[PDB]
C-alpha cells in the first residue's frame, strides 16, 4: 500500500435494521463466510435483549460500541536503537474496527456454552460499562497517557 | 482376498498329492509363496524360497489358512 491510499470497502446496509454498522459487527462473527449461521446467532441475541431489558437492541449497540472506542493507543516506532512505543490518537475509522474485534474475542471468552447468550451478555455489560471488552479498553488506555513522555513523537 | 477358490498353484497339488499316499519323505523345494496350506499336509516340511534360499519350514495343525509367503521372511534383523 505504497502508491494508493488503499480503499475503504463499502458495507451493505443491514437487511433488518438498515445499519451499515449492524453488519460490520456480524462480519466479525462470520467464520468461513457463513453469514447465515452468523447473523442467525446475532439475531438470536437481539431476542435475548428484548427478553432481558425493554431496551431495543439499538441503543445497546450505539452505547456498548461507544464505551469501548479507545481514544488513543500505542503504536511503536524506532528512531534508531530506540525501543520507544509512542502513544497517539486513533483514526475514527480504526476505532470501530478495534472495538468490534475486541467485542467478538471477548464474547468468545465468556463461559456461556451456547453463543448468542455470550454476545448478548457481553453487549449488556459493555453498554452497562463493565464488559471484558472494556477491560481491554482501559488496559490499552493505561499504556497510553502513562507514556505521555513521548508526546514529541506524533508521527 | 479371494472369494471363489483357493488360487493354489498346479505343481503344489500335483507334487504333494503323491507325497500324501503312505506319507513320503519331506524335501519339497518351491517357488509358490502365493498359495495356501490346505489340511492333510501336516508333518511334511517344505523348503519355501524367501527370495534368497530355501527355508525348511515344518507344518503343523494351527497354521492352515495362512500362505507360504507368510512364513519366509524377506528382510533381516527386525
Amino acid at each position: 500500500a505504497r502508491r494508493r491510499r488503499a480503499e475503504v470497502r463499502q458495507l451493505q446496509p443491514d437487511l433488518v435494521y438498515g445499519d451499515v454498522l449492524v453488519t460490520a459487527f456480524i462480519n466479525k462473527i462470520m467464520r468461513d463466510g457463513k453469514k447465515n449461521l452468523a447473523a442467525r446467532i446475532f439475531y438470536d441475541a437481539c431476542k435475548i435483549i428484548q427478553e432481558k431489558t425493554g431496551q431495543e437492541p439499538l441503543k445497546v449497540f450505539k452505547q456498548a460500541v461507544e464505551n469501548v472506542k479507545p481514544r488513543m493507543e500505542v503504536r511503536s516506532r524506532r528512531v534508531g536503537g530506540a525501543n520507544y512505543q509512542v502513544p497517539m490518537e486513533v483514526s475514527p475509522r480504526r476505532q470501530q474496527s478495534l472495538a468490534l474485534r475486541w467485542l467478538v474475542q471477548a464474547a468468545n471468552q465468556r463461559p456461556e456454552r451456547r453463543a448468542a447468550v455470550r454476545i448478548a451478555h457481553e453487549l449488556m455489560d459493555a453498554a452497562e460499562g463493565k464488559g471484558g471488552a472494556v477491560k481491554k479498553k482501559e488496559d490499552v488506555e493505561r499504556m497510553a497517557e502513562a507514556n505521555r513522555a513521548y508526546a514529541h513523537y506524533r508521527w | 482376498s479371494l472369494k471363489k477358490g483357493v488360487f493354489v498353484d498346479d505343481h503344489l497339488l500335483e507334487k504333494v498329492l503323491e507325497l500324501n499316499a503312505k506319507g513320503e519323505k519331506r524335501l519339497i523345494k518351491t517357488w509358490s509363496r502365493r498359495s495356501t496350506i490346505v489340511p492333510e499336509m501336516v508333518g511334511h516340511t517344505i523348503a519355501v524360497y524367501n527370495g534368497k534360499q530355501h527355508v525348511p519350514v515344518y507344518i503343523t495343525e494351527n497354521m492352515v489358512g495362512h500362505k507360504l509367503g507368510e512364513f519366509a521372511p524377506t528382510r533381516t534383523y527386525r
Binding site: - | Y58, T60, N62, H66, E70, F71, R78
Partner: protein, 124 residues
C-alpha cells in the same frame, strides 16, 4: 445399576451407556434397544428391574465383551506366537502389521520417540 461387569453409568441416555462397555458400540447399542422395546432416550436414573434383567438377557446371554472377548483376542495373538508367522512377528516385536509407512509416523505401536541419535554435519 450394576449392568454388565462392574459398569454403572447414569445421568445419560441408556443407549450410550452400553458403549462404555468393552465389546459394545453404537451398533449393538441401537440393537439390544430395538430387540427389547427400551426407548433409547431414557436414563439409567429410572428403569424397572425387569428392563435391567431383560437387558442382562439379550446382552450377557447373546455374545459371551470385556474379559470373556479380551481372553480370546489375546489367545489368538498367543496362537500367532506358536511357530511365528509374519503376523505373529511384528507383534512379537510390538510393531504394526497392516503394511504401513514405518520410516516415519508410527509412534502409536512404537514404544513415544527415543531421539537416540548421533549423526554429524561439520567437525574440523
Amino acid at each position: 445399576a450394576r449392568i454388565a461387569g462392574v459398569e454403572i453409568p447414569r445421568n445419560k441416555r441408556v443407549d450410550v451407556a452400553l458403549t462404555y462397555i468393552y465389546g459394545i458400540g453404537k451398533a449393538r447399542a441401537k440393537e439390544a434397544l430395538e430387540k427389547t422395546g427400551i426407548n433409547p432416550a431414557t436414563r439409567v436414573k429410572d428403569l424397572t428391574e425387569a428392563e435391567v434383567v431383560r437387558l442382562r438377557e439379550y446382552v450377557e446371554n447373546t455374545w459371551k465383551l470385556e474379559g470373556e472377548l479380551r481372553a480370546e483376542v489375546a489367545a489368538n495373538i498367543k496362537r500367532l506366537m506358536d511357530i511365528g508367522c509374519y503376523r505373529g512377528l511384528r507383534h512379537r516385536r510390538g510393531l504394526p502389521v497392516r503394511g504401513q509407512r514405518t520410516r516415519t509416523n508410527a509412534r502409536t505401536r512404537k514404544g513415544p520417540r527415543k531421539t537416540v541419535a548421533g549423526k554429524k554435519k561439520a567437525p574440523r
